[PDB]
Amino acid sequence: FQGSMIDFLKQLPHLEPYGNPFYFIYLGIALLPIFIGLFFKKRFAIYECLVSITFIVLALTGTHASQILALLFYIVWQIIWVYSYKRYRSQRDNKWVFYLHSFLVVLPLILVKVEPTINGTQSLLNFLGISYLTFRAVGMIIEMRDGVLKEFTLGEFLRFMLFMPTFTSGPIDRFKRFNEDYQSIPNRDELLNMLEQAVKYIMLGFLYKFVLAQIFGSMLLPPLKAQALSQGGIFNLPTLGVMYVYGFDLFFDFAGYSMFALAVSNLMGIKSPINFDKPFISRDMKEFWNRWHMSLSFWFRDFVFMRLVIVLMRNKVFKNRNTTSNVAYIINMMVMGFWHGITWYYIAYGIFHGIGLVINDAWLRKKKTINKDRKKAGLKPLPENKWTKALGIFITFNTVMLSFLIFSGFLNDLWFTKK
Amino acid sequence: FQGSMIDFLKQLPHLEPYGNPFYFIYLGIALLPIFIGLFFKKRFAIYECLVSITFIVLALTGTHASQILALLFYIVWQIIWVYSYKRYRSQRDNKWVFYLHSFLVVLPLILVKVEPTINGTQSLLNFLGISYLTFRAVGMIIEMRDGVLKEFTLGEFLRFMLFMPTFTSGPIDRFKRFNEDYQSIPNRDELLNMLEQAVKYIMLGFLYKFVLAQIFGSMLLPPLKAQALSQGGIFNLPTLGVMYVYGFDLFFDFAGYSMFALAVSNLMGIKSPINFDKPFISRDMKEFWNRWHMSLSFWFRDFVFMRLVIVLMRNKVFKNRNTTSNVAYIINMMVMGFWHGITWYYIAYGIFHGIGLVINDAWLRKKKTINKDRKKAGLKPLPENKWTKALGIFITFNTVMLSFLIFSGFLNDLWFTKK
Amino acid sequence: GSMIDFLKQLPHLEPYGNPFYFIYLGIALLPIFIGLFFKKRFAIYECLVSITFIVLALTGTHASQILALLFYIVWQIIWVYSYKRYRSQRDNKWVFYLHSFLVVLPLILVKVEPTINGTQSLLNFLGISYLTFRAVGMIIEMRDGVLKEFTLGEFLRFMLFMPTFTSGPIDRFKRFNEDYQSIPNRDELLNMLEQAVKYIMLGFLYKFVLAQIFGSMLLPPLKAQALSQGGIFNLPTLGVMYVYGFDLFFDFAGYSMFALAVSNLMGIKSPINFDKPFISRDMKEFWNRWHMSLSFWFRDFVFMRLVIVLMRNKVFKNRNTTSNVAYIINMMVMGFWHGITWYYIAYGIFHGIGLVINDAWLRKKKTINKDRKKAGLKPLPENKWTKALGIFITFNTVMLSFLIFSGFLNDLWFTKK
Amino acid sequence: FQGSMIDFLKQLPHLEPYGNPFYFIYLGIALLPIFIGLFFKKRFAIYECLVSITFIVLALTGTHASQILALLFYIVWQIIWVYSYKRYRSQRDNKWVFYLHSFLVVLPLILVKVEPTINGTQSLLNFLGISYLTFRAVGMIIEMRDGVLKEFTLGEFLRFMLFMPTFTSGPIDRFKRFNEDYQSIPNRDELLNMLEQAVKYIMLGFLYKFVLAQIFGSMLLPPLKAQALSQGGIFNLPTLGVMYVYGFDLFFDFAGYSMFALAVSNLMGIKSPINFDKPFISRDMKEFWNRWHMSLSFWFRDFVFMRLVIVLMRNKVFKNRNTTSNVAYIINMMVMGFWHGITWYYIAYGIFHGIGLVINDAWLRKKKTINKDRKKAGLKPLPENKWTKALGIFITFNTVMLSFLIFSGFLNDLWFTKK
Ligand SMILES: CCCCCCCCCCCCCCCCCC(=O)O[C@@H](COC(=O)CCCCCCCCCCCCCCC)COP(=O)(O)OC[C@H](O)CO
Ligand SMILES: CCCCCCCCCCCCO[C@@H]1O[C@H](CO)[C@@H](O[C@H]2O[C@H](CO)[C@@H](O)[C@H](O)[C@H]2O)[C@H](O)[C@H]1O
Ligand SMILES: CCCCCCCCCCCCO[C@@H]1O[C@H](CO)[C@@H](O[C@H]2O[C@H](CO)[C@@H](O)[C@H](O)[C@H]2O)[C@H](O)[C@H]1O
Ligand SMILES: CCCCCCCCCCCCO[C@@H]1O[C@H](CO)[C@@H](O[C@H]2O[C@H](CO)[C@@H](O)[C@H](O)[C@H]2O)[C@H](O)[C@H]1O
Ligand SMILES: CCCCCCCCCCCCO[C@@H]1O[C@H](CO)[C@@H](O[C@H]2O[C@H](CO)[C@@H](O)[C@H](O)[C@H]2O)[C@H](O)[C@H]1O
Ligand SMILES: CCCCCCCCCCCCO[C@@H]1O[C@H](CO)[C@@H](O[C@H]2O[C@H](CO)[C@@H](O)[C@H](O)[C@H]2O)[C@H](O)[C@H]1O
Ligand SMILES: CCCCCCCCCCCCO[C@@H]1O[C@H](CO)[C@@H](O[C@H]2O[C@H](CO)[C@@H](O)[C@H](O)[C@H]2O)[C@H](O)[C@H]1O
Ligand SMILES: CCCCCCCCCCCCO[C@@H]1O[C@H](CO)[C@@H](O[C@H]2O[C@H](CO)[C@@H](O)[C@H](O)[C@H]2O)[C@H](O)[C@H]1O
Ligand SMILES: CCCCCCCCCCCCO[C@@H]1O[C@H](CO)[C@@H](O[C@H]2O[C@H](CO)[C@@H](O)[C@H](O)[C@H]2O)[C@H](O)[C@H]1O
Ligand SMILES: CCCCCCCCCCCCO[C@@H]1O[C@H](CO)[C@@H](O[C@H]2O[C@H](CO)[C@@H](O)[C@H](O)[C@H]2O)[C@H](O)[C@H]1O
């Protein structure tokens, strides 16, 4: 019973997901039949299960091919703890059973995030897309608590959780929407619109990830980091340069990936949620989070923020609504900080964005009451000309870039602050 | 530039039939046109012949490239002795002429299976698929003898015998079914169903041959063989491990090949006979042989067993039907053992399966008699609960695995008897 | 490391330099033409392809001109939109002049910098000479009110048109926009594709065969012989004059046919540059055939406006004197547009005096023909000999003008430069 | 001038026609618009000229790039001497003017064939496909003499004489048939049939030229030539082997080229004359020349043989028809040998085939009169069965292979000279 299985895995091809442009040749041909079927309102179940698995495995057979075994564990784990809840949801419905099942479904993510904190080495049950997979898994469990979801076969569950395009780090979806958009193949005109948008997304992804992302990440970021470290100190102008360059590099690389993922999803007939919709023209933090990482932000708003507000109002822990809203903002953003990894700078990012949202809500209330004061006194309301818009965009852009510097992790390198 | 023809043949590319997964890329592309042409009612004869010859030659080259010549001679031999009988078939059917023609059709296989035993290593005319091509040749001399075949062209004959997806060691076929199947191209929906089933077969063959066959073949079997040899003796627990692991490895590897062959055959518009339909769950040995290697077992039942029973009843040599059935069982299984190869363990395998079949038949007769005895005595008949079925399945599974241990030739290493 | 050296590292593809460039262009522009067949336009794909090929054409040995292109784009956007906001209110007849001057300012700086110190200014790049003409066009089309509303997409799609850009035919905004909006039907698209293939073939013949023969086989040795023999005039001077004239035509017409072909592959029929110029009977009929786009641009926006301005102030006594002065000034402005050297200005003034002499000769011929018809004498016949004489004299004068424009007289002589 | 243009012509890209399988990717992508336009009943006159000129130039820009200049002369020659007849044909029809114009049109071929005899070096006017273009450019004059041809534009003349596929060494056509097939674009069903036949021809051309021609020409022919030269003498077994191998190599290489040319022609909507139609089952010399090099043989039969027979019968030079037929056979085959080139072995080939045809006609007459003699005497007519047909096949095959040995020029090496 020799254990050379790991070395067997570290031999397969390693076609990187959305790596070289030539990838979109292979994938394109691999997606040529499926799309054709949609034109005849015919869906090939087995062929999709073949292409999705082949490309997932090709994406996961890298230097750390062992993660495949972890994946083959993870899936099984979810099948154990989703279906279990379904059985329970047929008969009884208690808060503590739902909480336990949510915790047990999200436990692999908790282990992957916490193990480096304790051991210092990556956990065994960690693979490429786990952070963006439990979101689907636990998502389904939440839908069973509300009663929205009642029946689903294993084929639907596994084709939803393991969606090929949005697997590595892609838009976070929901089961209800994905299933409803999977059942009803769009008519020919909508399918043609989807094909045109997919080609446009592929071209823009080429531009974003292979040109602008490369310029901002492999040409300016390393020398800027080196100069900032060499000058040293608490802060310096090269740190401002690296902050802005990293913000733009992060945005362009992630937008390129998201455009690729949405294009490949459209080629399969499913419209995955968008990720970025002009995030930098946002003139406010609350308007920013409706532009930046749309899928993740909306997921945390629907399932972690709204539910917490409902829980807090159920027990009326806080008297006024504003205090409860601020507390929910802080807790939601802190949980979003943990999700990235339990280090010092991710928690700082979460607390910083939570404080930003609370400050923005307070300023909205103060602006409203100041407008009331000026209107009652007969004076004109506060200006809303181009200058106020420019000031708001400038403040939002600066705060967002500060957040992307803190999230960058460069603040460890600049000053070795352990905690 | 050439030297000897054998060296030039060795220089040619070698593609193991269903070896690395990339093989299915080649075939896929090579079968991309033909299958599309199947949707309409047209077939590309030249393209099919060229691709079939290409892949047969690629599978035949390598270290044993000289066998290609052994193929060509073989083909001519069949064309000499099939067509000859055709002419004779139009005049009269004398039994001895039919026997002579069948013998001369199977003569290359007789030489291949009898040459290494006498003094040599391998006969010259031996090549890769001769074991599973004689069945497609002597399957015509019989069909003419019964008159179900009267007219056919050389194109049909050499397109049926040299079927590319079923050449090396594949599902044995019959001429009448194959020809009548290739004449009538299926409809559009049937073709889509066949494509979906072909993709399912490809995936399941991947699992059966590149994972499970690898696990049971090169991970457990060599260490278990080493432990069994080191412990020595008549038998040991490592020998039992070898038995079970080799049986599962044989089933998984062969079912992987057979699913690959059925998939590639479906991609060319022909549904080749299925080899395995859930073995290891057979209650009886008689039910086992309707599930394990279905194509060959059915071939021997139709053309070796039933004909033997008909011959024995024609001369009424034996007193009753039961004796004829038992003798036919023994002789048919001995002929199967001979077909595998003239060694002590193959003949032991054939005799073992024959004794199993006759004992199963005797047990069925005795059970029917005792059920009649209980019915006439008023007692409730013998139980048929889940426990009895489980016991029957367990007994059949153990007997089959013992037969596969004998067929493995491992007992030759473990005992060195009859060396 | 990212510097100007990074820009210089980028691949370089001289526009219409080798046939493989046309293979690249055909492969790139096939989807656009196929989409045009179905009356649909791929806005993002066209922009990406145009930017790609502009960058490839600009990333030469001196690839530091891309920064100049970006600065020029920003400058033109700023001033065009500054006028657009201002035009809707009122036109002061001097703010229009200021905006036109500030739109031609990069070009005038580029054409005046090498004269002053030693070299061209920083903001010089490849197509700046044939891009200003587009920008000023818009300003003109705002002063007369024929243009009122347009978006930044239309403006930057018209100005940075990839097929022409470098030296291609000069377009106008009104015609270009009305042509871009209305995709032609399928039969006209097929006719345009066939004409594009014909243009590609004829451009091959003109630029890669005839231009090579007249520029690499005869011109260098003829120049060497002319320099060796020396003197004001010589037979090698005639050789270099004729060879350079034919080289200029067979190279520029080849480039313009390439540009029209590539433009037709994107659904727009750019103005034709040459319509068989060497058969022009008169000097005035030569400019309707030689560099048609530029000559028509100067006639419409520099000549006619100058005549209208002079007439509305009635500075001169009669119409013919105004026409002569407008001819001379327009051709001098054309020479200046080419570059501030002695021979370019000599070329401009030469063409101006040629046009005015042609006009005077036509008027004198009309008067003398009227007198002869009054006297009963038959007018001078023109069947094959007079027309041949006119064609020959116009061809000789044009070839002399191209000798002057060549700058070869700068090498042959050493006049004050 | 400088005169370096030839060196310029040598730096152009080179692409041997039908040299590599990758060449057909370029050819198919270039010819796709023409085929689509055919499907819509449209011909793009300019685009066809562009693709034809580009591929002619790519075929002619080899080490002998200077031949392009010769080609540019050849066209300018032929035009001058085609229209010089077209103007004359309308006015007067003296025989000697037609003879003079035909001679002047064929003069470049005469110079290319004669100058190596005198000077010993290839002539300036020689280029790749002059021998298969003079045929078209003299066929137009021959048609014009008969009055079959009338007003024709220069576009038709130059698109006929310079056909892109059948240019280097391709099927020899006629103007009337080519023009009539150019005007009437086939229907959609005929276009589909042409596409199928073009793909079949391309595949068979791959097989014939890149596999079988390579086997017979680059692996067996050099060793057989070396052995035959080493043994020496008038005749030897290696020389017989080289005779048969060269015959098969010539047939396979030429048939591969002809299938390629017919395929590319079908992709343009024009079906050029076939070149080979089962040559080796001829059973006779006449049935061979009606099967071997169909285009060239039919051209020489229509314009050089029939015309000479008509001339001889016009002046009744010989007493009987058989003598005139034999003389015409000999003269036609001598002119064919001359067309191949003025050496000893080409003229020997021509006179050998002429004698073969004459004795075949004598054999037919003698067989007919012997059959008449036997019928008059009441005896059974001479047999015509499998054995007689096999004897005829054997005799014709041996004579044809001897002819291809003489045409090979190998007899010049082995027999004459020294080595
Ligand atoms: C009434 C009495 C007089 C009648 C005369 C009838 C015949 C007159 C024919 C005169 C025109 C012949 C034009 C071509 C002759 C030479 C062609 C030849 O030999 O073939 C060369 C080219 O190959 C061809 O033959 C190409 C095909 C053309 C065949 C002839 C076409 C014209 C036929 C016209 C027949 C007209 C009959 C009368 C009609 C009323 C091969 O090159 P070479 O180097 O071997 O040339 C020969 C060598 O130099 C010895 O001089
Ligand atoms: C369902 C139909 C379609 C299925 C997919 C069809 C396409 C499949 C392509 C598989 C091969 C991809 O080919 C790709 O080649 C690249 C570049 O050479 C190689 O690249 C890889 O090499 C090895 C793994 O082999 C890794 O250590 C390396 O880091 C990685 O770059 C791999 O060999 C393979 O990742
Ligand atoms: C230390 C923690 C981080 C500090 C974070 C600082 C960022 C705080 C939020 C950004 C500043 C918001 O401050 C100001 O808000 C007002 C009031 O909505 C915005 O004003 C706008 O608000 C909304 C748009 O969403 C509209 O309804 C309104 O009409 C418009 O005026 C201004 O554009 C912005 O300048
Ligand atoms: C490496 C092994 C090489 C051995 C194989 C050699 C290739 C096999 C040769 C096939 C024989 C070719 O000869 C064949 O003759 C038969 C007899 O009519 C005809 O064959 C035809 O048979 C039937 C008749 O309807 C058709 O359905 C079929 O599609 C067609 O092939 C053709 O004429 C020709 O295809
Ligand atoms: C030494 C080599 C030989 C060893 C193997 C011998 C054969 C192995 C099987 C022996 C019998 C086991 O089979 C056991 O009995 C019979 C045989 O069909 C089955 O039962 C059978 O008999 C009765 C009716 O006749 C019904 O129950 C049923 O319709 C039928 O299948 C049992 O459900 C099965 O459990
Ligand atoms: C979405 C885009 C679709 C458009 C299709 C793709 C167009 C862009 C890719 C083409 C890039 C060509 O890339 C360029 O090719 C030229 C062609 O000689 C070569 O260029 C190199 O050699 C040439 C001449 O030999 C020199 O003049 C040049 O300075 C040097 O860089 C290089 O290979 C590369 O610089
Ligand atoms: C090499 C240097 C290149 C410099 C940059 C060149 C590109 C500059 C940006 C081009 C786009 C600017 O145009 C801005 O974008 C949007 C989104 O497309 C345009 O939107 C629209 O533009 C035009 C206007 O009808 C439409 O034809 C087009 O289909 C649509 O995109 C807006 O009109 C404008 O707000
Ligand atoms: C740089 C110095 C100037 C260079 C030369 C510039 C002038 C060159 C052209 C001068 C001649 C004008 O060219 C002249 O054009 C007119 C009108 O088009 C033609 O035709 C005219 O004259 C002919 C003479 O029979 C008559 O038909 C009629 O009077 C009129 O049509 C003349 O045949 C041609 O000679
Ligand atoms: C509308 C017209 C469409 C035209 C389609 C495209 C035509 C152009 C084809 C590509 C240009 C020629 O591409 C050709 O490629 C071959 C590939 O060996 C190379 O050419 C080669 O020719 C010969 C044999 O082939 C070699 O011995 C030689 O060393 C090399 O020059 C060059 O790279 C180029 O001559
Ligand atoms: C230097 C001379 C080179 C030429 C060499 C000979 C070339 C071959 C031509 C000779 C004829 C061969 O082809 C000949 O055809 C005739 C009539 O068709 C047939 O002739 C034969 O069969 C016929 C029946 O048909 C019988 O009368 C008899 O057995 C015999 O004459 C044979 O098929 C073959 O003998």
Numbering used by the authors:
A (entry chain D), B (entry chain C), D (entry chain B): -3 to 415
C (entry chain A): -1 to 415
Structure paper excerpt:
Through biochemical analysis and cryo-EM imaging, we discover that Streptococcus thermophilus DltB forms a homo-tetramer on the cell membrane. We further determined the cryo-EM structure of the tetramer form of apo DltB at 3.42 Å resolution, and DltB complexed with DltC at 3.50 Å resolution, and in complex with an inhibitor m-AMSA at 3.23 Å resolution. The tetrameric organization of DltB provides a scaffold for catalyzing D-alanyl transfer and regulating the channel opening and closing.
The sulfonamide group is embedded between the active residues His289 and His336, and forms a hydrogen bond with Tyr345. In addition to this aromatic cluster, a few residues with linear side chains such as Leu246 and Asp249 are also located on the surface of the binding pocket, enhancing the interaction between m-AMSA and DltB. The local resolution distributions of the best DltB/AMSA map demonstrate that the core of the transmembrane part has better quality, at 3.1 Å resolution, while the loops extended out of the membrane have a resolution of around 3.9 Å due to flexibility. The high quality of the density map allows for de novo model building of the entire molecule chain, from residue Met1 to residue Lys415. The inhibitor m-AMSA bound to the L-tunnel of each protomer blocks the active site. Our cryo-EM structure of DltB with m-AMSA provides a solid structural basis to target LTA D-alanylation for treating gram-positive pathogens.
